[PDB]
Amino acid sequence: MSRRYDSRTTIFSPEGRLYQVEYAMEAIGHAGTCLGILANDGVLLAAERRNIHKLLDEVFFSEKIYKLNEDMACSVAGITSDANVLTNELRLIAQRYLLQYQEPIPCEQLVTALCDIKQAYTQFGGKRPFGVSLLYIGWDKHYGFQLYQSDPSGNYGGWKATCIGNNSAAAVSMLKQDYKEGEMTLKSALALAIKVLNKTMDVSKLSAEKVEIATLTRENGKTVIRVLKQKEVEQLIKKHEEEEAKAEREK
Amino acid sequence: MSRGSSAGFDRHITIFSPEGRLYQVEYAFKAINQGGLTSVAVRGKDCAVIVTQKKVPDKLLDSSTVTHLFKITENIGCVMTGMTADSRSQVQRARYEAANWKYKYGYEIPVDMLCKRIADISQVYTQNAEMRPLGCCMILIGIDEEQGPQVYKCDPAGYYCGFKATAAGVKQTESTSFLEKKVKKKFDWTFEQTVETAITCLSTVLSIDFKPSEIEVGVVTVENPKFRILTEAEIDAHLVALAER
Amino acid sequence: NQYDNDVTVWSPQGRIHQIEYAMEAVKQGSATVGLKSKTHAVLVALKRAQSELAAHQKKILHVDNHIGISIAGLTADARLLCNFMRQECLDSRFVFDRPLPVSRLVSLIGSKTQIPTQRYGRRPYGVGLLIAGYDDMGPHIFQTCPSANYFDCRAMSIGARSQSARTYLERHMSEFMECNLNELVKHGLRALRETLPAEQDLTTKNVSIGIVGKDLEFTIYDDDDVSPFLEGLEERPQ
Amino acid sequence: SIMSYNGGAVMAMKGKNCVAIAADRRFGIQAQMVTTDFQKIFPMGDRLYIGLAGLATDVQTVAQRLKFRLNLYELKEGRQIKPYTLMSMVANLLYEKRFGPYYTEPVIAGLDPKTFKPFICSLDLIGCPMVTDDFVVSGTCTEQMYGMCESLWEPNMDPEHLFETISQAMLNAVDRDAVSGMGVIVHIIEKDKITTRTLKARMD
Amino acid sequence: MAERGYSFSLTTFSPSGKLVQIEYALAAVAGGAPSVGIKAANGVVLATEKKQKSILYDERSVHKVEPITKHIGLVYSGMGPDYRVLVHRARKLAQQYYLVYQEPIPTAQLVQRVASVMQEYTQSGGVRPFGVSLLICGWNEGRPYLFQSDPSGAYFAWKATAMGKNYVNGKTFLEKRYNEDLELEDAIHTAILTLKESFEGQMTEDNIEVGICNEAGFRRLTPTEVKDYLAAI
Amino acid sequence: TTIAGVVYKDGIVLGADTRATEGMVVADKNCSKIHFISPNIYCCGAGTAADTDMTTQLISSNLELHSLSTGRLPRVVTANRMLKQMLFRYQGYIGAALVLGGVDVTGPHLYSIYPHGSTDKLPYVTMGSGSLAAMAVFEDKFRPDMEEEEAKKLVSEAIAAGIFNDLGSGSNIDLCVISKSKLDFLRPYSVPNKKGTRFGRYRCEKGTNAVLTEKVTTLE
Amino acid sequence: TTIMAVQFDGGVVLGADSRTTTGSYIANRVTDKLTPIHDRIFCCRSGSAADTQAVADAVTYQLGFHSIELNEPPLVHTAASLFKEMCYRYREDLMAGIIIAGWDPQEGGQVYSVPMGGMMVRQPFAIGGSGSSYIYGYVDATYREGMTKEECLQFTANALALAMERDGSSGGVIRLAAIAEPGVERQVLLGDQIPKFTIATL
Amino acid sequence: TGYDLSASTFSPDGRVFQVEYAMKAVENSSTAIGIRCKDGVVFGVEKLVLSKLYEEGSNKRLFNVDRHVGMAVAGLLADARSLADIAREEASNFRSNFGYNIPLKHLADRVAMYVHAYTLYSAVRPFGCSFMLGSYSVNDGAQLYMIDPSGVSYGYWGCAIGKARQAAKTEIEKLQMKEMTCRDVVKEVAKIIYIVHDEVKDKAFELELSWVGEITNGRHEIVPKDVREEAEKYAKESLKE
């Protein structure tokens, strides 16, 4: 019956570990690279496009970047359909807060609500966990520009610069070396993102069709979230190539 | 993966094998043959006929209660093959579905719609792990006003289809090849020719000359759409006509 | 093995092992004897003390003015079943203003205890009951089992070493029907004594007696009310 | 009686390539005025507005729940809602409370996205939609508004004529209603800009 | 009898981070009959092979190319009864959308809802994932759409794709034959040729099913139209 | 409201007026009261307008699902059965009064459906507040197996009687002709009433309205 | 409404008027109030049209399924019992007076009355509806044992005509149905076919 | 290899082994027989007396499930009792809903479907009992049905269930039960029961007898003491040669 076919997804291991959560994290490590960088005048996401094929129809808005409300956006790594479930839940939570308070939801509260859903799947119900890690970028009147990262376990944390997915550890080393706290601008942050994606995507060269970049800024008391055009990413990659060539010429 | 590969509980519950197969559904198909009987259905130009093998080993058994032919409505008949209690539960479900369709929509259910409904119900068993699929196959005959006689078959996998002729049970492969030969040389099938074709298919694949008590025959015709089971006198008349030729 | 963990699993021999293990649970308990005459039904229960400083565990329970029980096996299951039986008797008195006939109560018990023997994740009740009753059909002794089967008996014994008691009851079953109350109780006491170790004897501390009868509502005698029944018992024949 | 508890009046009118929507500004409870700047017209898009008359509590509740559903719609579909779709969404929201209805009668005025064809409609309290080509009214002085609009409305008005027509209709209609008025706000929606005006009005 | 299903997941994460049940459902899809979708400039063609195992089968009785609405069509590769379940659910979802919004559901919206159902079966208690891949075509806002939805619940937008047996070779053939600006007739020819590449035996107007979506809506091709197209090839 | 329907030799003619009143004031001058059910089945509605619209939309959706499932043309009896079971389960609280007309494989069929869930299968029906005037026209002039033009004239006459004698009816006459080969949705079929010609010119000039505040938002 | 049913040796005769009113307005002047429940079982309906139509549809459904399951022609008493259960269970919500009449191989011709409230009684003949009050004396004085099918048809036609002439809620045409073992014969009496009784003048 | 643990699992051969194990449980119980004559049905059970401490009529395997319907069981007695309760519920509900006595064929079908419902799931266990339903009426005649743990229901002229059912069926075949009456069938039933009993394997047994027919006015009841004693004497005489 039930007992002999039950996988026991929500039980501790003898070492004190939750195996299904760890395996979901392995799934995350497989997926495409997503990077988040916070600057003084905005915040950005840069995600590797894994749906690359000449016969693929051009994407409507973005493959991996989802607007969540007027002030927040997210990028996903891991199982795609699980990410669809989670992004719908996030949109619902943000609208519920807006209905209740008639103010936009602060970013950390939205992340905390979604992480509570994830934790509930880790503790009871016998279901498998969501195989999704998320990066969140947002603005609120409490803490300004914010970047957050959440895991299948339901843990979350705020960051100045972070990376999830493929080669995320090398990207984090790059970020530790190169990020300058309290002095980043969106231009320098975009340059850093291009360099990090150049290193992380070692097998495939940076082309504008292999990456998706979205920036969140403030204009006239409104939040603007924009996915960069292909030509803008092409110009950024050209600028990075020029920087590399001149740095080589100096050396 | 590898041919006939297995991993985990794929041989015990309806979950995918490494090759993407559902072994429990295949085992249910074998459960059909466990019954040991064979039935044949043939579509004519103005009729549909079902002929099933009737076996009563012992005289203590009241023969009138040993039937695999059922009527679902006045105009729809069925022959069941496989496990008897599963067959009777499926017959009860089909009768309920037909009555409810008539009640809700105000006209008699078409044969293809009833077959599709039963097939959906059994697909559910192919996708949920806590219950086994039924080990039975259902063949339905009826008359649609627009399209004429109808023979439809549904199986434990949830697959259903309309047939010019079909068979179920132990010798259904030989029966299908015989019917393929008969339908390739297409000639206009009257009621008598349809009945004789069904009976000769069963008799040639079972390698026995029949007797009126050894087979069961049900028919629907355009002239008389009501499903009716032939008595032993009519069956013996057909058998005599077949034997003389 | 693979067939002896779930009550829903048939063994290849046509048996259910969990039911037999619940039967063993009944066999582990201390002995108790039930017998009937033309006019009386008597339960005699040998009580066991966990320690020298503990009271002997209660074995005879009130169900209704005309029905009492003695238990073997898991005590908490016995309390569940006793509460159910009391509720049935009260329902009968509320609806029909009549005492519930004993055999109907035993049928209700069998129906209630059969259900967990067929459903996954349930277990059999691990208690055997001797039911003494009096109704329009006279006195009744019934035996209920973890298998949910029940028996109408002339006499019965269940618990540890109950086979010796059953042999004694076999011997004197012909005598039981014409016995008076004292003689019937003494027959039950001798049958219960046949299940004792050699050193142990029947005492007012380890004997409990329940009696029901035509004019006698069900009554339990525990420590000092047992002595008139113990007085007059011949020494063990050996 | 219940619909008249707080008073209020909303009107929408069709121009040549433009729409107009106007509302009174009084919030009051029976005969007592409480405030004079209660919002009854809510934007549901760049060129789409909904005006709500009826119970003020249901005005606010329905506007907020419609904003909930519209935001979800525009996130799931990466497009702005069309006025007909908004009307259907409002009707579904109102009919969900068929036996416990919200006491508001919405009016929708907008331009088709990517087409800019004027659209106006009104709905009853349980969500029966009514699309017209000239004008829609809602509130406690619909008879007066009907007189004014039937007399003054003309086809193919330019936005300035549309503003004058809807302004005169609203002003003279609410001057003749006790529990509406204390100012009128008019929105003129064109394809390239939105003009918001407050009219000089009686305050009695 | 007890109507309670299992409440635990049957699809769980492997130590390497994979959900093997979804990969096995994909293996089931890869064993299915070939399906092809091609999005032309003015419409979409969905072509599948339906080679019956015998002449006793009535070809007209069952259909693999199915209408969902007047403007949306479906075809599949994999297990047919799972496909029937998903077709019924898609029709109900399209009707509910029409009931709320009083306009026909956009193709992308319906694809999202169907993919959500498939994900539910990848995560809920006591069920296996669906063993089919769907090709969905639609016409919206003067524009053709072609989507593929997998057993995991992930969907992709395609200009041309193939599923089922020999789908890698079919994809190579499509990407070396497909071009933009193609018209619907030429897309129909290309889809039939892609089926012909993996087809075994003679292809007739009864061996294959073809559906088209354009501004007029979605419709299945009658076997006479298919015979005309085959003669043109 | 006046809605009517007849069975003629080749099919069904449905008719309706186009006035929708709120109380005793005309709210809608051009209201569409003939509702699509299926390409061969239509329904005129009276009673609570929201109830009529929602009920017809729900049944149309369910019949579309049914016809996709069966691959066959819907029957009028199915629409009738669904409508009457739904209306009966609501015990008259859904106030939809319906004239349901269609042509299926069995021929033309016409039903009247009442809010409590009772139906009548009749060769001519009327419904609404003008129903008695239209019915008077029908009882005076109906004949079986009328031609299409005769049936259209008769239904337009019945609607006109409702329009000119019932205060709750007015404006235009809408027709829907259904046969096995065609469906003609004639809207408007007749325009017996028009707004009177204006004898004057109201003063409506730029600058007439005084403005306190102004705010112009430019759209991109 | 006036409904009537009479038993004769080999079957039953059922009859009804055809008037359905809403107040004083005749909404349907050719109503068919004789409803086949099964091949040889009919019901006459009086009271709320929605209630009787719904209950007759439900009983038709249940009786058809039951007959398929038993592989046996239904008993008239079984149909009457189904009607009785439905009418008694929902007596506070239904306004339905039913006559159930038909033929059985086991019992012959049978008439059952299920009046409002949900009681069930077998009768040699039954009348119902608003018009039935006016013909109680007539049917009491006229009915005799041993009438043939033709005598029963004439008896029913006369009684229905008298009720229709007196009762404002009854009128239109007379619908008759003779049920026997061979089958069902239905007829409509209209116009001069309806029995005529001269108005007493002077 | 682990295929015999649930009724919701098919073996690779297409068998449900849990149902077969329940059938084995039936094959170990003592023998009950039913015989359908021209005017009734007679049930005879060999009820083994396991303890002399038991009363007469304890653990009876013949039940009245309706005024006209009797039940003879074999297998797990608690399962049989729950099934008798199910049959009583079905008969009573049928009378309440349709207003007459349930036909025996319909009652057999209903109870057989209830039994079959326990052969599909891992959450329940198949019943470990088989049984015969016997009825008589003027309209329907005499009817004898048999239902096994799989849920298969069949009509019979004579039937045996239990440990020795093949030998009992052989004995039944030697009878011209189609022209016999209940009076002489009761003797034949008692003789067959006494023949199939094994005195070495099983020590003592009571002979339970019941019948329904025109003799009892279509009411299932225990055979009266006179007829039972006469039948037992005749059976004992037939044992001696």
Swiss-Prot record, chain A:
Gene3D superfamilies: Glutamine Phosphoribosylpyrophosphate, subunit 1, domain 1 (3.60.20.10). One of its GO terms (cellular component) is nucleus. The modification N6-acetyllysine is found at residues 127, 176. Its main location: cytoplasm. Coiled coil: none annotated. Keywords: Acetylation, Cytoplasm, Nucleus, Phosphoprotein, Proteasome. The keyword Metal-binding does not apply. The keyword Secreted does not apply. It is found in: Cytoplasm; Nucleus. The 26S proteasome consists of a 20S proteasome core and two 19S regulatory subunits. The 20S proteasome core is a barrel-shaped complex made of 28 subunits that are arranged in four stacked rings. The two outer rings are each formed by seven alpha subunits, and the two inner rings are formed by seven beta subunits. The proteolytic activity is exerted by three beta-subunits PSMB5, PSMB6 and PSMB7. Belongs to the peptidase T1A family. This is Proteasome subunit alpha type-4. It comes from Bos taurus (Bovine). The lineage of its organism: Eukaryota, Metazoa, Chordata, Craniata, Vertebrata.
Curated annotation (Swiss-Prot), chain C:
It comes from the Eukaryota. Pfam families: Proteasome (PF00227), Proteasome_A_N (PF10584). The modification Phosphoserine is found at residues 107, 174. SMART domains: Proteasome_A_N. The keyword Thylakoid does not apply. Disulfide bonds: none annotated. It is found in: Cytoplasm; Nucleus. CDD domains: proteasome_alpha_type_1 (cd03749). Gene3D superfamilies: Glutamine Phosphoribosylpyrophosphate, subunit 1, domain 1. GO terms for biological process: immune system process; proteasome-mediated ubiquitin-dependent protein catabolic process. Glycans are attached at residue 107. PANTHER family: PROTEASOME SUBUNIT ALPHA/BETA. This is Proteasome subunit alpha type-1.
Curated annotation (Swiss-Prot), chain D:
Pfam families: Proteasome. It comes from the Eukaryota. It is found in: Cytoplasm; Nucleus. The modification N6-acetyllysine is found at residue 76. One of its GO terms (cellular component) is proteasome core complex. The keyword Cell membrane does not apply. InterPro entries: Ntn_hydrolases_N (IPR029055), Proteasome_beta_3 (IPR033811), Proteasome_bsu_CS (IPR016050), Proteasome_sua/b (IPR001353), Proteasome_suB-type (IPR023333). Transmembrane segments: none annotated. The modification N-acetylserine is found at residue 1. Signal peptide: none annotated. GO terms for biological process: proteasome-mediated ubiquitin-dependent protein catabolic process. Keywords: Acetylation, Cytoplasm, Nucleus, Proteasome. The 26S proteasome consists of a 20S proteasome core and two 19S regulatory subunits. The 20S proteasome core is a barrel-shaped complex made of 28 subunits that are arranged in four stacked rings. The two outer rings are each formed by seven alpha subunits, and the two inner rings are formed by seven beta subunits. The proteolytic activity is exerted by three beta-subunits PSMB5, PSMB6 and PSMB7. Non-catalytic component of the 20S core proteasome complex involved in the proteolytic degradation of most intracellular proteins. This complex plays numerous essential roles within the cell by associating with different regulatory particles. Associated with two 19S regulatory particles, forms the 26S proteasome and thus participates in the ATP-dependent degradation of ubiquitinated proteins. Belongs to the peptidase T1B family. This is Proteasome subunit beta type-3. It comes from Bos taurus. The gene is PSMB3.
Swiss-Prot record, chain G:
Keywords: Acetylation, Cytoplasm, Hydrolase, Nucleus, Phosphoprotein, Protease, Proteasome, Threonine protease, Zymogen. GO terms for cellular component: cytosol; nucleus; proteasome core complex; proteasome core complex, beta-subunit complex. Its EC number is 3.4.25.1. Its main location: cytoplasm. The modification Phosphothreonine is found at residue 35. Transmembrane segments: none annotated. It is an enzyme of class 3 (hydrolase). GO terms for biological process: proteasome-mediated ubiquitin-dependent protein catabolic process. One of its GO terms (molecular function) is endopeptidase activity. The 26S proteasome consists of a 20S proteasome core and two 19S regulatory subunits. The 20S proteasome core is a barrel-shaped complex made of 28 subunits that are arranged in four stacked rings. The two outer rings are each formed by seven alpha subunits, and the two inner rings are formed by seven beta subunits. The proteolytic activity is exerted by three beta-subunits PSMB5, PSMB6 and PSMB7. Component of the 20S core proteasome complex involved in the proteolytic degradation of most intracellular proteins. This complex plays numerous essential roles within the cell by associating with different regulatory particles. Associated with two 19S regulatory particles, forms the 26S proteasome and thus participates in the ATP-dependent degradation of ubiquitinated proteins. This is Proteasome subunit beta type-6. It comes from Bos taurus (Bovine). The gene is PSMB6.
